[PDB]
Design a binder for this molecule. Structure first.
Ligand SMILES: Cc1c(Oc2ccccc2OCCn2ccc(=O)[nH]c2=O)cc(N(C)C(=O)CCl)c2ccc(C#N)cc12
Lengths: 547, 400
């Protein structure tokens, strides 16, 4: 017999202060008992389990469907935490084209990884005897049980330690481990590739691990986690948008799931309206009517999802490019590619929940998202193509009160272009009328007044029903914008209004703010000055609006 | 040569912080560095039974082309038991202070056996292809608060001759940094620094004297417009929260009526007297401003434009312990985030020299931008805490 190298065991403990599981065995039928006796007899003959005496106080229920199935949920609740087997799943666009990719089945190695001796007593289980007239057969696991908490992590760690020297001494190949399957790619000649595959089978056999000589069942196109992986390209598994006369809540969640999933390769997918219909529902069976906007959006989705689109694999020798387009209503779409017209992948970005926003902020956020995604997938920041002029960005970041930055980028003329819609002056405007504005409201009756007095004697006070102080302050500024020329100075005491306008929004939830924005767009020069209220600053008439 | 028992605070588990993504060059740099450290026994690979993790990344210090390994021990530091020196109040009063990196000395002292599993970190893989290279420390790690506490005795033994030789030189230690303050000449200071580094070998010019607290100043004009007077009343009204006797009624008296903003208003005599009294009041220090070692230090930064930044360190509102203006230009003329990050580092250093601890920052930047880019320009061995302000503060120009 050729000596088999031992696999190092991982020391395992239970959670602090807890004890091993002690669960009552399920009563089983006579046939199920016989099946489990045969299966456990074979497994004991193979070494996966061992018989134990009555001293072991722990027990885990067993079932059969034959096939044995041990329910380790309690022991899992009582087992220590392990380092996550995988932090995330890879993305196909990060893979690098290989001339040859082979699949090896290391499933028989799963039951060949030993379990820590001092922990085996916690895996004890009992087979009930026929008519319960004898003590049930007591077993414990000697290897990693499937369904136990630490089996995938310990298995992947052991396999990684086994594969480390082979991968080190063969840098011209690539080995990947996923569940009980290995994937070995190389650009070598097919003969050399099969040769090194045989070498890997031998190196794995030096630990007693058997890879089947049978030709594996997996073969291109590889279907994996909703993906199609081909020798030269990748895509998503076919996305079919169903034809529904009426759409319920689960139909809209499945449609937005298919659209979110398909958006990573299909450019231009929009999910704003369809997801908007699911806002604040919390009812799975509720039937919600479809808005016209959701109908046009769904039609555009069916037009985009008409024919299949594929993504290419990553070539590290070429530059990485990411191009962004604005879609309106806070929607953004982007393509990441290296060669024109051949996308590595695509995606979308929706604006965050906010009361006020502008296009430049959203474009910046999207750039940050694409940057993080690209560092994840490819390990580098891409060069950007953005629909915004260089001078626009320069004005924005030079004048913005917050620090901001986007990495290396170039302007691409693809409307709609992100632009600054208004710019407040830094100094008062000579020759322009000065509007001292103010507003006020009663907290009980919700009655208020908003208005202005100017240096030329122009005045206005308007009474308002069902309003607040902040609303009357904004309304005052709006009135001043309405009745003034193309250049105007505006004086207010509203720290609230200044807080809104200094954030430079181009869209808002409040229709009043949006009206103020529309007035600002029409102006040539606007200087907005702030003063403290109730300090006797003349012109600023608090008593005029509190009548 | 002998391990000291180290434990965590009662009821707290080890740190379990997600490793953020890294570029390929940083990953490779960490692979080389950690390979070398493993050959030196400073770290060792760990198995899946270790669930704890602390983030790691790579930087490049000043005047160097070699990569350096940075570990974000903030969570482990706040979860590590409190170790137990009064802060040298004369370090900030010294003429010059030099910062030295003594982090290599920690690697000669082994780490407590049972505590090593809490120092676990992960070199990540691109695209989650491999599980990531997992390590734990066997010696005192750089960045952990227990390293200077444990090494304090040996450091006293090494610095005892130099301290006995020069009683006029102040020596302070914070994390992996050694602050050496004196009053000598720049050349004599540099030769003395080489003397101390060769003294430490066989076993950053900073001038706090050129730093003072900044007063509130008011304009001096011969002619005031309506806008000028309005801004002045605004700034005086803001300053009245800090200074009691600030009076603005005589200046607000001039703003009576609805005049154009650019119209020149002559000051009355009462307004001149009021303004002069307010100047005299602003020339005095703030009443009842003390430091409390039990409270956090809060630092606020405002972006003033043209590479200028303002900052205030305080503990209670309107009770500033420090104020300053960082306008230095060092290869960051086109990058706001790099400027902000350098400013945060300098303010943290000043706070370390003055109080011996780092402040909590309020940063004028969106969370996503900062968290995306701040590691790109970080050069210090420590990391402070920070939060993000999304509403433009009105007081910005009042610090300009
Ligand atoms: C074939 C396969 C993976 O491929 C590779 C394996 C080894 C080296 C390079 C590879 O990819 C290069 C790109 N490529 C892809 C297919 C092809 O024919 N030619 C080609 O060049 C990668 C996977 N992922 C995503 C992994 O995280 C590795 Cl476990 C797989 C996952 C599941 C399945 C199944 N069934 C199969 C997987």
């Amino acid at each position: 017999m050729v000596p088999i190298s031992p696999i190092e065991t991982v020391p395992v403990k239970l959670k602090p202060g807890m004890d091993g599981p002690k669960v009552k065995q399920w009563p089983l039928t006579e046939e199920k008992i016989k099946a489990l006796v045969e299966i456990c007899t074979e497994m004991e003959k193979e070494g996966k389990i061992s018989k134990i005496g009555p001293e072991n106080p722990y027990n885990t229920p067993v079932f059969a469907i034959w096939r044995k199935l041990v329910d380790f949920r309690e022991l899992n609740k009582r087992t220590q935490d392990f380092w996550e087997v995988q932090l995330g799943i890879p993305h196909p666009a990060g893979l690098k084209k290989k001339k040859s990719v082979t699949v090896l089945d290391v499933g028989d190695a799963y039951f060949s990884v030993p379990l820590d001796e001092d922990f085996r007593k916690y895996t004890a289980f009992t087979i009930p005897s026929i008519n319960n007239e004898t003590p049930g057969i007591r077993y414990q696991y000697n290897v990693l049980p499937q369904g136990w908490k630490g089996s995938p992590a310990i298995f992947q760690s052991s396999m990684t330690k086994i594969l480390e020297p082979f991968a080190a001494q063969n840098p011209d190949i690539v080995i990947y481990q996923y569940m009980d399957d290995l994937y070995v790619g190389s650009d070598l000649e097919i003969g050399q590739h099969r040769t090194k595959i045989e070498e890997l089978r031998q190196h794995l056999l030096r630990w007693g691990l058997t890879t089947p000589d049978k030709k594996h069942q997996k073969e291109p196109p590889f279907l994996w986690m909703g993906y199609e992986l081909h020798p030269d390209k990748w895509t998503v598994q076919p996305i079919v948008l169903p034809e529904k006369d009426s759409w319920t809540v689960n139909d809209i969640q499945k449609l937005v799931g298919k659209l979110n999933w398909a958006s990573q390769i299909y450019p231009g997918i929009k999910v704003r309206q369809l997801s908007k219909l699911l806002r604040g529902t919390k009812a799975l069976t509720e039937v919600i009517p479809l808005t016209e906007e959701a109908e046009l959006e769904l039609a555009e989705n069916r037009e985009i999802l008409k024919e299949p689109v594929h993504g290419v694999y990553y070539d590290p020798s070429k530059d990485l490019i990411a191009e962004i387009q604005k879609q309106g209503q806070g929607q953004w779409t982007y393509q990441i590619y290296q060669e024109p017209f051949k996308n590595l992948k695509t995606g979308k970005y929706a604006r965050m929940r906010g009361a006020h926003t502008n296009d430049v902020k959203q474009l910046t956020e999207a750039v940050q998202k694409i940057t993080t995604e690209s560092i994840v997938i490819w390990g580098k920041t891409p060069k950007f193509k953005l629909p915004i002029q260089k001078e626009t960005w320069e004005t924005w970041w030079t004048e913005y009160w917050q620090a901001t930055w986007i990495p290396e980028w170039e302007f691409v003329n693809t409307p709609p272009l992100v632009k600054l819609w208004y710019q407040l002056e830094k100094e008062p405007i000579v020759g322009a009328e000065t509007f001292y504005v103010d507003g006020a409201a009663n907290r009980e009756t919700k009655l208020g007044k908003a208005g202005y007095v100017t240096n030329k004697g122009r005045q206005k006070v308007v009474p308002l029903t069902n309003t607040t102080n902040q609303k009357t302050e904004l309304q005052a500024i709006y009135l001043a914008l309405q009745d003034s020329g193309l250049e105007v100075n505006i004086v207010t005491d509203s720290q609230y209004a200044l807080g809104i306008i200094q954030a430079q929004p181009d869209k808002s939830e409040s229709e009043l703010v949006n009206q103020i924005i529309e007035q600002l767009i029409k102006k040539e020069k606007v200087y907005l000055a702030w003063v403290p209220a109730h300090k006797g600053i003349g012109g600023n008439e608090q008593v005029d609006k509190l009548v | 040569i002998e391990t000291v028992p180290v434990k965590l605070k009662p009821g707290m588990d080890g740190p379990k912080v997600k490793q953020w993504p890294l570029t390929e060059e940083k990953i490779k740099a960490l692979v080389e560095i950690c390979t070398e450290m493993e050959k030196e026994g400073k770290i060792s690979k760990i198995g899946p039974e270790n669930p704890y993790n602390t983030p790691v990344f790579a930087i490049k210090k000043k005047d160097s082309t070699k990569w350096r390994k940075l570990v974000d021990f903030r969570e482990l530091n706040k979860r590590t038991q409190d170790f137990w020196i009064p802060h040298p109040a004369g370090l900030k009063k010294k003429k010059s202070v030099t910062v030295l990196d003594v982090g290599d000395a920690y690697f000669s002292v082994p780490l407590d056996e049972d505590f090593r599993k809490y120092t676990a970190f992960t070199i990540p893989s691109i695209n989650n292809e491999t599980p990531g290279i997992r390590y734990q420390y066997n010696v005192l790690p750089q960045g952990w608060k227990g390293s200077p506490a444990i090494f304090q005795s040996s450091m006293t033994k090494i610095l005892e001759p130099f301290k006995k030789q020069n009683p006029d030189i102040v020596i302070y230690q914070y994390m992996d940094d050694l602050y050496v303050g004196s009053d000598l000449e720049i050349g004599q200071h540099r030769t003395k620094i080489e003397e101390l580094r060769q003294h430490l070998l066989r076993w950053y010019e900073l001038h706090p004297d050129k730093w003072t607290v900044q007063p509130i100043v008011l304009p001096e004009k011969d002619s005031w417009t309506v806008n000028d007077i309005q801004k002045l009343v605004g700034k005086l009204n803001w300053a009245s929260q800090i200074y009691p006797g600030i009076k603005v009624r005589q200046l607000s008296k001039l703003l009576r009526g609805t005049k154009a903003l650019t119209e020149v208003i002559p000051l009355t005599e009462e307004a001149e007297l009021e303004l002069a009294e307010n100047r005299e009041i602003l020339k005095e220090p703030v009443h009842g401003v003390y430091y409390d070692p039990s409270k956090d230090l809060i630092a606020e930064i405002q972006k003033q434009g043209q590479g200028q930044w303002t900052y205030q360190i305080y503990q209670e509102p309107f009770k500033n312990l420090k104020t300053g203006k960082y306008a230095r230009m060092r290869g960051a003329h086109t990058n706001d985030v790099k400027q902000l990050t350098e400013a945060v580092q300098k303010i943290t250093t000043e706070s370390i020299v003055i109080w011996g601890k780092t402040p909590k920052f309020k940063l004028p930047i969106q969370k996503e931008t900062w968290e995306t880019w701040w590691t790109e320009y970080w050069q210090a061995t420590w990391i402070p805490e920070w939060e993000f302000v999304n509403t433009p503060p009105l007081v910005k120009l009042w610090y300009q």
